[PDB]
Design a protein around this nucleic acid. Sequence first.
RNA 1: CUUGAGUCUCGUAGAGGGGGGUAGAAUUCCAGGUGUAGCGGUGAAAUGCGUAGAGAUCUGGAGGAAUACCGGUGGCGAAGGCGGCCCCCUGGACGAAGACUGACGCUCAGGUGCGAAAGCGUGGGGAGCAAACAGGAUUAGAUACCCUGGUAGUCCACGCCGUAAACGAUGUCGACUUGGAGGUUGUGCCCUUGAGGCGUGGCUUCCGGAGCUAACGCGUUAAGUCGACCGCCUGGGGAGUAC
Lengths: 50, 88, 129, 100
Amino acid sequence: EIDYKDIATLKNYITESGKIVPSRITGTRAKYQRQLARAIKRARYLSLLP
Amino acid sequence: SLSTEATAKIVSEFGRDANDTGSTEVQVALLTAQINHLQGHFAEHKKDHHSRRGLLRMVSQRRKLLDYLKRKDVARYTRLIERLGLRR
Amino acid sequence: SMQDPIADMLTRIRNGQAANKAAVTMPSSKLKVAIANVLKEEGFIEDFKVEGDTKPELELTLKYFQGKAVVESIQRVSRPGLRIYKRKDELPKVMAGLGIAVVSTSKGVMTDRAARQAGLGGEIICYVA
Amino acid sequence: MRHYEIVFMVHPDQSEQVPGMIERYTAAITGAEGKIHRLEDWGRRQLAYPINKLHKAHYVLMNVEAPQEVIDELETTFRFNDAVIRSMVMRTKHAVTEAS
RNA sequence: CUUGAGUCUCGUAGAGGGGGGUAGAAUUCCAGGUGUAGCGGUGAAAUGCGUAGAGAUCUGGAGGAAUACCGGUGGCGAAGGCGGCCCCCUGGACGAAGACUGACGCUCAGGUGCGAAAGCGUGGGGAGCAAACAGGAUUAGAUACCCUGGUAGUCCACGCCGUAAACGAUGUCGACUUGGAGGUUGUGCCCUUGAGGCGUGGCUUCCGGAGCUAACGCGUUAAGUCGACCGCCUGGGGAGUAC
């Protein structure tokens, strides 16, 4: 349902330095976690984020 | 990896009718198509070993099906091993 | 089961007895039905019933005197790996005659007493007790 | 023949030859039996880190549907061309055409 | 014959594998300035650097290694083991209905293949490190410990090796036997809101019942109850040694 391009729901899952927030404090179902992390990693390497 | 269209063609061309997916001729023809193509794969890379294992399963299972044919009906078996080019 | 369906049936019987199960089921064979006949005519089970046409199922009904199962042991004797055949003068007494041996004779599957009577031995299927 | 998603940044320095490059590659794909299902531009956003001593890049994503092979020469050109430093090509796993 | 086994049709998850390029963090020197009494370390100095400009700064380079968060009670793989991103090729697994075959099976001595690390050989590569080796002091003497450099190696290609506490110290396959607590991944019914409520599979972690066990424990992923086949054991040492 959710992919990398929509930068909206990524800033809430990140810190200032660009570290992906652990699912231990978010609540993510552990499938959306893998896809979400792939999204942040793609965006960082696509350089929306550091 | 082998495409759906190719499986349909093989099931037709070795099957006793349409959608006889499970006879020994159909099974062996699918396995032999897959052997040939993968032998294409491993020619270029000889240093893939986890995939080559699946290929040994293909070869082994195809020998087991051909042995079942030979034991059951010799006539269809001998028609197959050249009508498909096998036991070279 | 995979190779010995008759040790499968005995394993089901003694596992269901130690589980205090009322009835066990298993895929039927005609020799499973034969041994079941021997047991229910020896009072080791209540009853059985084979339902199904392409997939018959044998419905053994286990038997408890109070809270204790009627069968103490039921052990496969001749298995694939050792077939056991006895001549009628060397048919086995199972627990000094208090328990049966079911043998396969050439006049069918009978108990051990019946076989030593009719003067013919055969393949020893199991010991029940 | 299954969906891709080309994403490529054209630098403001490289912003000189945006249409030429885009149209040349679209023509190559169309001649290569490839039809664009969607296309949009995200302007010149801001770059989190000063990549290649610059802070701006005009983000154009073209995301065509293409066969197995016709993509290799495109990335070959991208490596051989200075127009875009990084053009990353994507997959679908499904059928999606609409943009957002 | 169709229940085992397989073929098919459709989807799902995955650090499964081989390739191909790919980017930064850190990394050292150089390329310069910015700067002059320090850099350095142990049981302690010292050895080694530096005032010839030494470190750090930003600046660009060089090049190799490895991919911090995610990350896990996670996952995939026969095992070894697999972790940046993206493409190509590829393997296996699982779930839902249906179709097809028609016992086509299980296990396997011999055999064959894969197989950490070190190592070897052949070519390279060498940013850090680091057996050897090289300074200092050791300590009862020091070839202690240490710190300072440091080469093989580590990395890549090909070939060899074929070994590990290669371990769950638990062979493979099938069947049957009470529960409770989870995780991961499908899927059906009904909330047709996203989860949901109720199922239903596969994998997986932990308690525990009977049973079993010498005990510890195991306990439906059994070390229970059985069946098929294989491997293996027979007091300790000598010795996995000699031939």
